[PDB]
């Protein structure tokens, strides 16, 4: 269990937490604003998934400051997580390419 597989695994777990908490915080922030469609938990969870994966169909979109602020956190946490995995996959491939040589 090296670092790159530990961080990537921890990123996946953290991403799940952000998706769940993001759904809760989105509804809590979007309600009270007339015209907002992100006001129920199940679809807010679906919105979080297509937000963290960047994607963004447009069927659901935050219209409040805190609702959009939550979205930004979801985006970054999504991009970083899916990006931390790629960096982990590279370290795996690089470390094995040395084994196909003299290291």
């Amino acid at each position: 269990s090296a670092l790159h597989w530990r961080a990537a695994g921890a990123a996946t777990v953290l991403l799940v937490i952000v998706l769940l908490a993001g759904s809760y915080l989105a509804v809590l922030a979007e309600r009270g604003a007339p015209g907002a469609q992100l006001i129920t938990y199940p679809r807010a969870l679906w919105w979080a998934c297509e937000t963290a994966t960047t994607v963004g169909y447009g069927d659901l979109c935050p219209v409040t400051l805190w609702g959009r602020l939550v979205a930004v956190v979801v985006m970054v946490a999504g991009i970083t997580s899916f990006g931390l995995v790629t960096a982990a996959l590279a370290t795996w491939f690089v470390g094995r390419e040395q084994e196909r040589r003299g290291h």
Partner: antibody
Amino acid sequence: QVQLQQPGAELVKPGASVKLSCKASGYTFTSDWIHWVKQRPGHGLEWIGEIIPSYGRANYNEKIQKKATLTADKSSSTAFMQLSSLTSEDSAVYYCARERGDGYFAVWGAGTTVTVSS
Amino acid sequence: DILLTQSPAILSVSPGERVSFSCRASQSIGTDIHWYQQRTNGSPRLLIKYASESISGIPSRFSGSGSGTDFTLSINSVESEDIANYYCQQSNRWPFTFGSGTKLE
């Protein structure tokens, strides 16, 4: 079991105030929203406002005159609606309902018949 | 705010006949509409959630359909205990709104 409990009636004279209660039972999640619905005799349902006991945040209907204050109490699982400075137009039956956060009102209360007179 | 129009206000029907209630939204709300029932001096009771999804406890007599702006609550062969006030409620955009209501006789 009766999930939502409300007082039978509340008599208020114009200018005064009243604090209705909505003691809830059954499954109490963290995503539960307590709504309040006003219904005048002969008329239909009217959404007053909503509140989430978990966070304490409350939203209200903006199209009508705002004279309601929603507070909660997680210790006793009871929602409270504070009506201030009422007139004859505010005399109606006030229902409270529980929403699981999925849009619809699963269960309603018996409703509190608030009468405004001297 | 989304406006929900229920026409007609009073719906008269013979016993054992199929009766359909109407609910029209001022804008497309998908299937985020919900039907309720309120008898004389009673509390509203959920009949149909999300346009067509049925509720446990509610008789199979009731059914729902529609999508977008037009929705319909139908009762296959109506009986005496179905005499009440029927309201529709949307949950697509904040705030939640109700219909004007429809009286069944």
